[PDB]
Design a protein around this motif. Structure first.
Motif, PDB file in Angstrom:
ATOM      1  N   UNK A 178       0.812  -1.214   0.000  1.00 34.63           N
ATOM      2  CA  UNK A 178       0.000   0.000   0.000  1.00 34.63           C
ATOM      3  C   UNK A 178       0.847   1.267   0.000  1.00 34.63           C
ATOM      4  N   UNK A 179       2.168   1.122   0.072  1.00 41.00           N
ATOM      5  CA  UNK A 179       3.043   2.275   0.279  1.00 41.00           C
ATOM      6  C   UNK A 179       3.591   2.868  -1.013  1.00 41.00           C
ATOM      7  N   UNK A 180       3.228   2.308  -2.161  1.00 42.74           N
ATOM      8  CA  UNK A 180       3.762   2.798  -3.423  1.00 42.74           C
ATOM      9  C   UNK A 180       2.697   2.676  -4.487  1.00 42.74           C
ATOM     10  N   UNK A 181       2.916   3.360  -5.601  1.00 36.82           N
ATOM     11  CA  UNK A 181       2.024   3.273  -6.751  1.00 36.82           C
ATOM     12  C   UNK A 181       2.700   2.450  -7.833  1.00 36.82           C
ATOM     13  N   UNK A 182       1.914   1.927  -8.767  1.00 36.66           N
ATOM     14  CA  UNK A 182       2.452   1.115  -9.841  1.00 36.66           C
ATOM     15  C   UNK A 182       3.209  -0.104  -9.339  1.00 36.66           C
ATOM     16  N   UNK A 183       4.261  -0.456 -10.068  1.00 37.94           N
ATOM     17  CA  UNK A 183       5.082  -1.618  -9.745  1.00 37.94           C
ATOM     18  C   UNK A 183       6.465  -1.235  -9.236  1.00 37.94           C
ATOM     19  N   UNK A 184       7.104  -2.182  -8.567  1.00 35.13           N
ATOM     20  CA  UNK A 184       8.480  -2.036  -8.140  1.00 35.13           C
ATOM     21  C   UNK A 184       9.359  -2.574  -9.262  1.00 35.13           C
ATOM     22  N   UNK A 185      10.320  -1.776  -9.718  1.00 32.17           N
ATOM     23  CA  UNK A 185      11.298  -2.231 -10.696  1.00 32.17           C
ATOM     24  C   UNK A 185      12.581  -2.588  -9.980  1.00 32.17           C
ATOM     25  N   UNK A 186      12.994  -3.840 -10.151  1.00 37.24           N
ATOM     26  CA  UNK A 186      14.210  -4.330  -9.528  1.00 37.24           C
ATOM     27  C   UNK A 186      15.382  -4.218 -10.481  1.00 37.24           C
ATOM     28  N   UNK A 187      16.551  -3.996  -9.903  1.00 39.76           N
ATOM     29  CA  UNK A 187      17.761  -3.766 -10.671  1.00 39.76           C
ATOM     30  C   UNK A 187      18.938  -4.416  -9.941  1.00 39.76           C
ATOM     31  N   UNK A 188      19.955  -4.814 -10.700  1.00 45.48           N
ATOM     32  CA  UNK A 188      21.083  -5.548 -10.134  1.00 45.48           C
ATOM     33  C   UNK A 188      21.944  -4.721  -9.173  1.00 45.48           C
ATOM     34  N   UNK A 189      22.533  -5.409  -8.200  1.00 48.57           N
ATOM     35  CA  UNK A 189      23.410  -4.800  -7.217  1.00 48.57           C
ATOM     36  C   UNK A 189      24.778  -5.457  -7.295  1.00 48.57           C
ATOM     37  N   UNK A 190      25.829  -4.647  -7.213  1.00 49.24           N
ATOM     38  CA  UNK A 190      27.171  -5.148  -6.955  1.00 49.24           C
ATOM     39  C   UNK A 190      27.507  -4.893  -5.501  1.00 49.24           C
ATOM     40  N   UNK A 191      27.956  -5.926  -4.796  1.00 48.49           N
ATOM     41  CA  UNK A 191      28.377  -5.781  -3.415  1.00 48.49           C
ATOM     42  C   UNK A 191      29.901  -5.689  -3.301  1.00 48.49           C
ATOM     43  N   UNK A 192      30.585  -5.533  -4.434  1.00 48.11           N
ATOM     44  CA  UNK A 192      32.045  -5.564  -4.479  1.00 48.11           C
ATOM     45  C   UNK A 192      32.708  -4.509  -3.597  1.00 48.11           C
ATOM     46  N   UNK A 193      32.067  -3.356  -3.443  1.00 49.20           N
ATOM     47  CA  UNK A 193      32.606  -2.300  -2.592  1.00 49.20           C
ATOM     48  C   UNK A 193      31.873  -2.221  -1.242  1.00 49.20           C
ATOM     49  N   UNK A 194      31.029  -3.208  -0.952  1.00 45.99           N
ATOM     50  CA  UNK A 194      30.285  -3.246   0.296  1.00 45.99           C
ATOM     51  C   UNK A 194      29.027  -2.398   0.342  1.00 45.99           C
ATOM     52  N   UNK A 195      28.686  -1.745  -0.770  1.00 44.24           N
ATOM     53  CA  UNK A 195      27.533  -0.847  -0.834  1.00 44.24           C
ATOM     54  C   UNK A 195      26.375  -1.470  -1.607  1.00 44.24           C
ATOM     55  N   UNK A 196      25.207  -0.842  -1.491  1.00 47.17           N
ATOM     56  CA  UNK A 196      24.085  -1.136  -2.359  1.00 47.17           C
ATOM     57  C   UNK A 196      24.312  -0.383  -3.664  1.00 47.17           C
ATOM     58  N   UNK A 197      25.196  -0.933  -4.489  1.00 48.53           N
ATOM     59  CA  UNK A 197      25.670  -0.261  -5.691  1.00 48.53           C
ATOM     60  C   UNK A 197      24.910  -0.800  -6.895  1.00 48.53           C
ATOM     61  N   UNK A 198      24.439   0.107  -7.746  1.00 47.06           N
ATOM     62  CA  UNK A 198      23.580  -0.243  -8.867  1.00 47.06           C
ATOM     63  C   UNK A 198      23.854   0.722 -10.018  1.00 47.06           C
ATOM     64  N   UNK A 199      23.226   0.491 -11.163  1.00 46.52           N
ATOM     65  CA  UNK A 199      23.444   1.326 -12.333  1.00 46.52           C
ATOM     66  C   UNK A 199      22.129   1.887 -12.832  1.00 46.52           C
ATOM     67  N   UNK A 200      21.965   3.192 -12.683  1.00 46.79           N
ATOM     68  CA  UNK A 200      20.830   3.880 -13.255  1.00 46.79           C
ATOM     69  C   UNK A 200      20.974   3.914 -14.767  1.00 46.79           C
ATOM     70  N   UNK A 201      19.838   3.901 -15.448  1.00 49.51           N
ATOM     71  CA  UNK A 201      19.814   3.868 -16.899  1.00 49.51           C
ATOM     72  C   UNK A 201      19.773   5.250 -17.571  1.00 49.51           C
TER      73      UNK A 201
END
Length: 330
Positions: A177-200
């Protein structure tokens, strides 16, 4: 199990958010800054150098019947903004929004830098990046999330930060109930210990979307959105009178301006940051020059999707065996 806690801006600018955390027995409630860009849970305490405490609530382990000194363990951390803290370590019971972890490493500050002392509203940090970044020596410790994970209904937490308003951190479930539409999931690299991802990519205001890969971190403990200089220049070029000021330390703009929105891509989806989210107010009291909420990452060495970006979304931190990040509009 699950947990749900409200997170509240510390001031009128949303400079940071605090979430109440129960530590020890009987509970000692401290207001912590939940930080998906670091991995230490540390607190102001009865051990903190007295001159470095100014209004914070402290953890007193001697008053907790479940506290145990973690023998020989110390910690020391420096943050991207130049602030720092250090001390020793207890294990104790820690609860967030009804979710309880026993044996959590609670890092007790003996020393904190001036910026922490000067912020009376933040009693410590609760790190939510990967435990590989935890600074405890000689035995690295796990984050609250890492400790809770196996007990959670689903191995996730979500950040739903408000704009000039409270929001929510949930553990173990996705509130549909906390969001509209759908959740889009995207890949994470943990190589640097962060929640690191690539925006398009990105767009400025009603402008066309530029498809371009922007690697960065989802960081609830950073106030602003830090992006490559090219992107940031393109944004501020749409604001009359905006300029980069070395003396101030970033882009400033006339407080009379109406700021354009900024859109970032998550896969084929788009998150729109309203212009008002990008206003951080007068550079000094009474000034008509205002500080921008989108700043260059040049010389940080990493792009940072901080609160300015995250508060425009419902964000899923999926700690499954292969972690991912999810973003929805809200």
């Amino acid at each position: 199990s699950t947990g749900s806690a409200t997170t509240t801006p510390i001031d009128s600018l949303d400079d940071a958010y605090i979430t109440p955390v129960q530590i020890g027995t009987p509970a000692q409630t401290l207001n912590l800054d939940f930080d998906t860009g670091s991995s230490d849970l540390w607190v102001f305490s009865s051990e903190t150098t007295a001159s470095e405490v100014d209004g914070q609530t402290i953890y007193t382990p001697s008053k907790s019947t479940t506290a145990k000194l973690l023998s020989g363990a110390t910690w020391s951390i420096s943050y991207g903004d130049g602030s720092s803290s250090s001390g020793d370590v207890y294990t104790d019971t820690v609860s967030v929004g009804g979710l309880t972890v026993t044996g959590q490493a609670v890092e007790s500050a003996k020393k904190v830098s001036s910026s922490f002392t000067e912020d009376s509203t933040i009693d410590g940090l609760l790190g939510l990046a990967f435990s590989t970044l935890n600074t405890v020596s000689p035995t690295q410790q796990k984050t609250f999330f890492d400790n809770a994970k196996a007990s959670l209904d689903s191995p996730v937490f979500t950040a739903d930060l408000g704009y000039h308003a409270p929001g929510t951190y949930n553990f173990g479930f996705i509130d549909t109930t906390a969001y509209t539409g759908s959740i889009t999931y995207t890949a994470v690299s943990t190589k640097q210990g962060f929640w690191e991802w690539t925006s398009t990519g990105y767009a400025v205001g009603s402008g066309t979307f530029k498809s371009t890969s922007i690697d960065g971190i989802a960081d609830t403990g950073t106030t602003l959105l830090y992006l490559p200089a090219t992107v940031v220049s393109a944004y501020w070029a749409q604001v009359s009178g905006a300029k980069s000021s070395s003396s101030v330390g970033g882009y400033v703009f006339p407080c009379s301006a109406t700021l354009p929105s900024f859109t970032f891509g998550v896969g084929s989806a788009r998150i729109v940051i309203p212009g008002d989210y990008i206003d951080f107010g007068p550079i000094s009291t009474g000034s008509s020059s205002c500080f921008g909420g989108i700043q260059s990452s040049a010389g940080i060495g990493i792009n940072i999707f901080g609160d300015v970006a995250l508060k425009a979304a419902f964000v899923v931190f999926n700690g499954a065996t292969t972690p991912t990040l999810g973003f929805a509009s809200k």
